[PDB]
A = this chain, B = another copy of it.
Amino acid sequence: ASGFRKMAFPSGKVEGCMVQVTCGTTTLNGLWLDDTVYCPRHVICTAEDMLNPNYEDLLIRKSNHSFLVQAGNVQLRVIGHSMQNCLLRLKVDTSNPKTPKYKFVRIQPGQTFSVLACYNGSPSGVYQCAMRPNHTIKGSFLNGSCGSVGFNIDYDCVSFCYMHHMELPTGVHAGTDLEGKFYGPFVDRQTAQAAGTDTTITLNVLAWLYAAVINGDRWFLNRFTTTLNDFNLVAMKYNYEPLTQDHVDILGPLSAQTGIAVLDMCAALKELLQNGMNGRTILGSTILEDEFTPFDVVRQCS
């Protein structure tokens, strides 16, 4: 066993759910599960509308015939519509036989998921990312990628956690869950909203340092330990998220796999933050990586 990669879930179960939704001159992606298509509600909006849209008002002026849904080049007739928070739910007259076992999950900041980038209902690529502490994603989404989704897979069950809606002024991305509720304080209208202060996901950096040790990188270890409190006093000065006992407990399995006490790994991290990596690498990286969860590491190394 060797190597460590930013790995995404295989995307096939999600590929079979992607469709195109068109309303007026706006086209974006939808998610087709059973007899329902989910997509961002701003598909119904004019540029003037975006604006200061009242979505109940804009929606009541649609019918079913206002929505063109296509799987490939085959139209799916819309037989009903409704809004749920910032999503539209379109009922179509055919069921998708490729619908996987699935659920809708609202993820927490710091958690990771795979994104299937799509344009015009066609999968383009797949990548793994993390939900930042500030509820943005550092994604890769070009014009027309709205409605692309984020997901995890436990065996044969797909947990959908993200649907893409917008790009913020800093070039980061924002998004709803599959109940249409935004992650973070963002709204689907044209206003001067901005990504909040972000932090490094400490739990994930510690996970990745465990990954390095599993992979044979130990140069950053030392003979010291720390208390949680003393660690946080240091880490917080470097814009790291405060580390809690729950996070310490989460790292349990990896500490037992490697035989390095969590607080001894925290001591290593403290040293790296204070002294840097002059100019060495960990798992080939020159920076401390924070987009692998403890669970991610356990999965990839076990």
Measured CA separation A11–B3 after assembly (Å): 20
A139 touches B5 (CB 8 A): yes
B215 touches A171 (CB 8 A): yes
Of B2, B171, B172, B284, which contacts A141 at CB under 8 A?
B2
Q: Does A229 contact B (CB under 8 A)?
A: no
Measured CA separation A4–B302 after assembly (Å): 29
Of B3, B117, B302, which contacts A171 at CB under 8 A?
B3
Task: Identify the closest chain B residue to A98 (Cβ).
Answer: B12
Question: How close is A276's CB to chain B, nearest CB, in angstroms?
Answer: 10
Of B8, B284, B287, which contacts A125 at CB under 8 A?
B8
| Size bracket of the A interface | 35 or more
Q: Is the interface of A mostly helix, strand, loop or mixed?
A: loop
A300 touches B140 (CB 8 A): yes
One complex includes copies of this chain to the number of 2
Contacts of A167 in B (CB 8 A): 1-3
Interface string of A187-214 (1 = CB under 8 A from B): 0000000000000000000000000000
Residues 243-302 of A contacting B (Cβ, < 8 Å): 284, 286-287, 299-302
Q: Given A126-B126, A171-B215, A171-B216 in contact, is the A139-B10 Cβ separation under 8 Å?
A: no
- Mind listing 17 A-B residue pairs with CB under 8 Å? A1-B143, A3-B173, A4-B140, A5-B140, A6-B6, A7-B140, A8-B8, A8-B126, A10-B12, A10-B116, A10-B123, A11-B11, A12-B12, A12-B13, A124-B299, A286-B286, A286-B287
B215 touches A5 (CB 8 A): no
Q: Does A106 contact B (CB under 8 A)?
A: no
Q: Given A171-B215, A171-B216, A286-B286 in contact, is the A16-B12 Cβ separation under 8 Å?
A: yes
B173 touches A117 (CB 8 A): no
A3 touches B125 (CB 8 A): no
Q: Does A142 contact B (CB under 8 A)?
A: yes
A172 touches B3 (CB 8 A): yes
Q: Which residue, A11, A117, A143, A167, has most C-beta atoms of chain B within 10 A?
A: A11
Q: Does A78 contact B (CB under 8 A)?
A: no
Of B11, B286, B287, B300, which contacts A10 at CB under 8 A?
B11
Q: Does A15 contact B (CB under 8 A)?
A: yes
B10 touches A126 (CB 8 A): yes
Residues 146-196 of A contacting B (Cβ, < 8 Å): 167, 170-173
Measured CA separation A4–B142 after assembly (Å): 10
Measured CA separation A143–B172 after assembly (Å): 37
Question: How close is A10's CB to chain B, nearest CB, in angstroms?
Answer: 4
User: Which are the 4 A-B pairs with shortest beta-carbon distances?
Assistant: A12-B12, A7-B125, A2-B171, A3-B140
A141 touches B15 (CB 8 A): no
Question: How close is A250's CB to chain B, nearest CB, in angstroms?
Answer: 21
Task: Identify the closest chain B residue to A155 (Cβ).
Answer: B122
Contacts of A141 in B (CB 8 A): 1-3
